[PDB]
Design a protein around this ligand. Structure first.
Ligand SMILES: Nc1ncnc2c1ncn2[C@@H]1O[C@H](COP(=O)(O)OP(=O)(O)OP(O)(O)=S)[C@@H](O)[C@H]1O
Ligand SMILES: [Mg+2]
Ligand SMILES: [Zn+2]
Lengths: 89, 512, 629
């Protein structure tokens, strides 16, 4: 679900890559659940480690920036995430 | 070449802005630097063209939001605001200043969108030199005077008017809203007269290695603290404990954020109260502190509402207390002040914040200041009594809020009068100038932290102190004093010596 | 615009193919109704159906909106205005810049002023006065019979308090509502508006279309369920809500109860009974008078904080100010009406003038504020819970004077607080040691010295879930309350019917805390103590292995009640009964042997020291001293 929101965020910002701070702040301000920024950061790290092809992270200077492929089909990605969750069970 | 790495970093991030240091241009080419100073408005387009061509040559597949713009900064002309002359018109200038007010977002047209009234033929006109080149004929039906301007379709740029402490600054596009009132900024921009300054760049370490080595050498002296006590206020005699307390207040404590705990930001800054007969060293000491300490404030015994003549909106002005944020505020004749102001003072003393709810205006302000107050006993003479209220008549709340209270009594001892008269008739330099930067370095660099031994010592001190009567606020003040002494020794850990010295000073003040 | 025609065709496609029933067919058929002329379309359905169209609409909303209206008209005519909802992104008022003009965004704010409904001429049929030529369908750039008019409303909105950066003046924004959006918003409400930022001659104005005010995830729901079944939920919540505060747990219980709050009731006579709780804390300095205010402010998002003297009468309830442009008089909101359905905290309540407290009087009890000033007549809701902090006269509780002489407050103000706690500071070595170690541990070990049973967000979710239940009062609770109030009232702070209503509210709050649909007498017994205690120490001293005074009284009460009930026993039998009754708490052998030790010691101590138990001749008979009540 959060991933979906993330997509919309990158749809809204007209930008190819965004910083951790701004993206996490916007996701928290738009998420259905009240969460801490650290939890959002760990969730983003988990998304990067599970699904690197869709979502990429780049270490620049003293920050890490987030880039995503907007042309990917959301349904197939959701199916892959469900399969991964089933496997982890 | 750092500029190729800068261009690569811009490529990675996609932000089309170049920051160029003017000293680098001066070193590389003095004539080019002179041309930049004389005619910035003509060399900036050339710089933009050159950097754009280089970047497109290196990486031609760049999808840039805007063309790369060059922002020179830190010109040699660091002229004072009062040194402006009619000679430097249309030249680059750099001014350091304080920001007072910032205007709202002002949209300015940069592309006029015109549409034919018959066939809906659309055209765009670039805005140039404050005049609109409105088309008179149609591009399809050739009908004269059939053009209509659409404000919504037109392109707008954000511009902001800012008052700098005064001069008027005009921030455009990206530079807009990057500066908050109450901050110190170095503004680099072109001077223009209609007078105003158009901003090009904003600017928001200070010690060489030899200075740090000298500071370490001085700190390795075990006597430096006492020597620094001798350094403070040379004209003041036999007030060594007062000088020690002033130095500890100058060092202050360390700031801690308790956001994870759910607690409010605890005060970490020291306040000292002085009480005695008038004509003593109170006023001179207050003047000395105000002059020595940067951002210091002197007041005698808050925010207010001002009507904006332009938008008829009620804006807020900051009093001396807010203006002295992160500084030291000193007050004379504390006793002679109105009770309403002293009632207000409780919040700033305790929570370091200030809340106003008046005439529908609700606001909260940060007030990180240290209060150094001087008071006069009500009898104008030290009547033999027991409690300080019996001589000064102050409420228990204000007295409990003070970290340190000192009393200036002129003793009836003849030798003291001899020494005072000799000091007067006979009425160091290496210390205070170094000490300003030393205090700045200590504030910026080091922060102490508490230990287990000091924990046990403080617990024992508290349980012993309560037998004399004791509030947890004096325990907090003792922690702050220990932190200040640890900063004095430039020690990253609070040890037994700091706690023992703080307890000694507190007990000496209580005994007196 | 070719892209506009493409957008119109794609919107027709979405209207005609979205689904196993097409959601919008019934809405389009109802659009024929004259009172219905705007269509509400979800943004999520638009984006899932196709992404290019969704992005184009989000980016060129002003460009394609008339084409969307044309598509709607064509679709309806085959068998009008378009409204959008559920945009996933929220934005701040300070974020509104010129770069966002024409973008479909939704903004959150609070309505402060309203203006009456006006007709706006959209397309006008003009008659030339020279040649009598009728010019029809003339759009307006910002014959009445043949022209088209649309209802209009103007709204003035202000920044929310939470989004307001410190030291910043909350900016105001103008909002234009048309057609069904008119009169859908009321002054003093917080709303999210979906629309665009248009350019008025320049000037910044927002055109809006819509207004804003079981399905929870499985794991959050299960966590809430599990924590709802905790037997020690009350104490765990009390400890977790104030992890860094030592002792004074009665204040913690009171503030938790006022956070839960009771239920409001309106009589058939139209009179509303307050379903909230007001709390007063008065104490000598150096206590935790303030810290509770800060904790409740940071925890509850609907909390407002204020100081005593700095607040005027106008700033608390409301003020009447003349509007510059309209040349009339309007109302500027006060703190109390901004704290609606929240909690308002006042610090240093004593320093406030009587002229301010008399203004507070009405909002205290009647829960509403009435203004009859300068030709302006109005009534406003003030549904707030007030938490007041104060110190006694001269800052120290002087025991040489009476209790009444130690509080400089008016009688009705004293009466209208449900809970009134007075804190007295005493010099005890064990309390000093505990306070010192807690403070130093917090100063040295900031994060590792915090053990929270439940997360703050979890507490917030549980409180939100619990506040919507409305428990019923049982007959047993009814007669228990009757007899308890009998006993209490048969004995300065006089106890009137207001205290009875407070007791009912407290029982309802206890019922809501435990997620019980009915009220039980145990809640009444719990609240009776809290209402009784009044003056309270920081911590009770230990009693000789040590045991607290409250537990000692509890054990004594239990044993006396059991013996007195059996009167209408043996030592071993009574101990066996006690261990049978306390089996719900013991979880280990060590706890059982500890409980046996404790009960043996307590029975011996009562037998030989307090004389409440008398021995009668290895298993001696025990009887109750006939003068214990
Ligand atoms: N039980 C306690 N646990 C932890 N800290 C405490 C406790 N009691 C007092 N303190 C400390 O003492 C301080 C005094 O609390 P405050 O509520 O700010 O003062 P106060 O009692 O309200 O007096 P006023 O009204 O500000 S003049 C707190 O901020 C804590 O640091
Ligand atoms: Mg307080
Ligand atoms: Zn034409």
């Amino acid at each position: 679900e959060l991933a979906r929101v993330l997509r919309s965020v990158f749809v809204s910002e007209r930008k190819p890559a965004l910083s951790m701070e701004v993206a996490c702040a916007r996701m928290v301000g738009s998420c259905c659940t009240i969460m801490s920024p650290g939890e959002m950061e760990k969730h983003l790290l988990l998304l990067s480690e599970l699904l690197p092809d869709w979502l990429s992270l780049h270490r620049i200077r003293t920050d890490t920036y987030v880039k995503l492929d907007k042309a990917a089909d959301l349904a197939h990605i959701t199916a892959r995430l469900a399969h991964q969750t089933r496997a982890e069970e | 070449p750092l500029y190729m790495q800068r261009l690569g970093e811009i490529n990675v991030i996609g932000e089309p802005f170049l920051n160029v240091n003017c000293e680098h241009i001066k070193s590389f080419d003095k004539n080019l630097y002179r041309q930049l100073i004389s005619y910035p408005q003509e060399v900036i387009p050339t710089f933009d063209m050159a950097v754009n061509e280089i970047f497109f040559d290196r990486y031609p597949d760049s999808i840039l939001e805007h063309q790369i713009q060059v922002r020179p900064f830190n010109a040699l002309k660091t002229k004072n605001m009062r040194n402006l002359n009619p000679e430097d018109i249309d030249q680059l200038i750099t001014i350091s200043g304080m920001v007072i007010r910032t205007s709202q977002l002002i949209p300015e047209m940069q592309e006029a969108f015109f549409q034919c009234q018959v066939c809906a033929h659309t055209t765009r006109v670039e805005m140039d030199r404050g005049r609109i080149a409105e088309p008179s004929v149609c591009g399809r039906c050739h009908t004269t005077h059939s053009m209509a301007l659409i404000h919504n379709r037109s392109l707008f740029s954000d511009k902001q008017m800012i008052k700098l402490q005064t001069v008027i600054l005009f921030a455009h596009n990206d530079l807009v809203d990057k500066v908050q009132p109450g901050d110190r900024v170095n503004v680099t921009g072109i001077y223009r007269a209609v007078t105003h300054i158009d901003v090009i760049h904003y600017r928001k370490k200070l010690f060489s290695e030899k200075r740090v080595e000298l500071l370490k050498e001085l700190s390795r002296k075990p006597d430096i603290y006492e020597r620094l006590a001798s350094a403070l206020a040379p004209s003041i005699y036999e007030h060594e404990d007062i000088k020690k307390g002033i130095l500890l207040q100058l060092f202050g404590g360390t700031r801690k954020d308790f956001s994870h705990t759910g607690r409010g930001k605890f005060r970490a800054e020291i306040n000292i109260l002085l009480c005695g007969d008038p004509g003593t060293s109170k006023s001179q000491l207050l003047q000395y502190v105000y002059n020595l300490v940067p951002r210091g404030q002197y007041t005698s015994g808050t925010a207010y509402v001002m009507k904006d003549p332009e938008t008829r909106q009620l804006v807020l002005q900051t009093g001396a207390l807010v203006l002295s944020d992160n500084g030291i505020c000193c007050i004379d004749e504390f006793d002679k002040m109105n009770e309403s102001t002293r009632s207000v003072l409780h919040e700033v003393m305790e929570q370091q914040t200030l809340s106003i709810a008046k005439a529908g205006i609700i606001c909260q302000l940060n007030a990180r200041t240290s209060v150094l107050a001087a008071a006069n006993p009500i009898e104008s003479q030290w009547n033999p009594k027991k409690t300080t209220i019996e001589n000064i008549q102050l409420p228990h709340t204000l007295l409990s809020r003070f970290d340190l209270i000192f009393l200036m009594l002129d003793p009836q001892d003849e030798a003291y009068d001899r020494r005072l008269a000799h000091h007067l008739v006979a009425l160091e330099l290496l210390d205070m100038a170094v000490l300003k930067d030393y205090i700045a370095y200590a504030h910026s660099t080091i922060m102490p932290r508490l230990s287990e031994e000091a924990s046990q010592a403080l617990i024992e001190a508290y349980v012993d102190m309560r037998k004399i009567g004791a509030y947890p606020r004096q325990l907090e003040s003792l922690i702050r004093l220990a932190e200040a002494h640890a900063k004095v020794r430039l020690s990253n850990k609070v040890e037994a010596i700091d706690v023992e010295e703080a307890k000694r000073l507190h007990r000496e003040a209580l005994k007196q | 615009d070719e892209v506009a025609e493409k957008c119109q065709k794609l919107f027709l496609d979405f209207l005609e193919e979205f689904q196993g029933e097409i959601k919008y067919l019934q809405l389009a058929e109802e659009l024929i109704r004259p009172e219905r002329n705007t269509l509400v379309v979800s943004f999520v359905d638009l984006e899932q159906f196709n992404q290019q169209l969704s992005t184009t609409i989000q980016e060129e909303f002003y460009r394609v909106y008339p084409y969307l209206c044309r598509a709607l008209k064509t679709f309806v005519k085959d068998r009008f205005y378009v409204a959008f909802q559920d945009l996933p992104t929220r934005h701040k008022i300070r974020e509104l810049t010129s770069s966002r003009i024409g973008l479909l965004t939704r903004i959150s704010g609070q309505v402060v002023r309203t203006h009456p409904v006006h007709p706006e001429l959209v397309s006008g049929t003009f008659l030339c006065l020279d040649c009598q030529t009728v010019i029809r369908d003339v759009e307006q750039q910002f014959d009445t019979n043949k022209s088209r008019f649309v209802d209009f409303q103007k709204v003035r909105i202000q920044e929310t308090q939470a989004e307001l950066p410190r030291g910043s003046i909350p900016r105001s924004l103008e909002v234009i509502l048309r057609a069904e959006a008119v009169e859908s918003a009321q002054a003093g409400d917080k709303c999210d508006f979906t629309g665009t930022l248009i350019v008025v001659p320049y000037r910044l104005v927002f055109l809006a279309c819509c207004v804003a005010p079981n399905q929870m995830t499985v794991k959050e729901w299960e966590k809430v369920f599990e924590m709802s079944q905790d037997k020690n939920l009350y104490h765990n919540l009390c400890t977790s809500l104030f992890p860094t505060i030592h002792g004074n747990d009665e204040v913690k219980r009171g503030v938790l109860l006022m956070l839960f709050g009771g239920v409001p009731k309106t009589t058939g006579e139209g009179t509303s009974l307050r379903g909230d709780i007001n709390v007063c804390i008065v104490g000598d300095p150096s206590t935790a008078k303030s810290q509770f205010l800060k904790h409740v402010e940071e925890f509850s998002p609907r909390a407002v904080y204020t100081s005593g003297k700095a607040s005027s009468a106008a700033g608390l309830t409301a003020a009447v100010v003349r509007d510059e442009e309209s040349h009339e008089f309007v109302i500027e909101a006060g703190a109390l009406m901004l704290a609606d359905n929240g909690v308002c905290c006042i610090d240093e309540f004593d320093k406030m003038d009587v002229r301010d407290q008399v203004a507070i009087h009405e909002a205290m009890e009647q829960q509403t504020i009435s203004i009859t000033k300068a030709g302006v007549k109005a009534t406003l809701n003030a549904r707030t819970s007030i938490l007041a902090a104060a110190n006694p006269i001269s800052g120290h509780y002087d025991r040489s004077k009476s209790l009444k002489q130690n509080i400089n407050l008016s009688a009705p103000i004293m009466s209208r607080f449900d809970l009134f706690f007075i804190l007295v500071d005493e010099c005890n070595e064990v309390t000093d040691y505990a306070i010192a170690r807690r403070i130093v541990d917090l100063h040295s070990r900031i994060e590792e010295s915090i053990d929270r049973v439940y997360s703050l967000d979890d507490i917030r979710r549980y409180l939100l879930f619990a506040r919507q239940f409305k428990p019923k009062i049982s007959k047993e609770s009814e007669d228990f309350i009757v007899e308890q109030y009998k006993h209490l009232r048969q004995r300065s702070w006089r106890i009137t019917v207001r205290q009875l209503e407070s007791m009912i509210r407290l029982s309802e709050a206890m019922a809501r805390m435990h997620c019980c649909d009915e009220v039980q007498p145990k809640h009444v017994k719990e609240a009776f103590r809290l209402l009784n205690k009044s003056i309270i120490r920081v911590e009770t001293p230990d009693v000789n292995l040590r045991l607290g005074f409250s537990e000692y009284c509890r054990i004594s009460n239990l044993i006396v009640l059991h013996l007195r009930k059996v009167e209408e026993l043996k030592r071993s039998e009574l101990v066996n009964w006690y261990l049978k009754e306390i089996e719900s708490e013991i979880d280990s052998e060590e706890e059982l042997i500890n409980k046996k030790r404790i009960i043996e010691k307590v029975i011996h101590r009562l037998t030989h020291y307090d004389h409440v138990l008398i021995e009668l001749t290895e298993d001696p008979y025990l009887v109750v001293n006939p003068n214990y009540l």
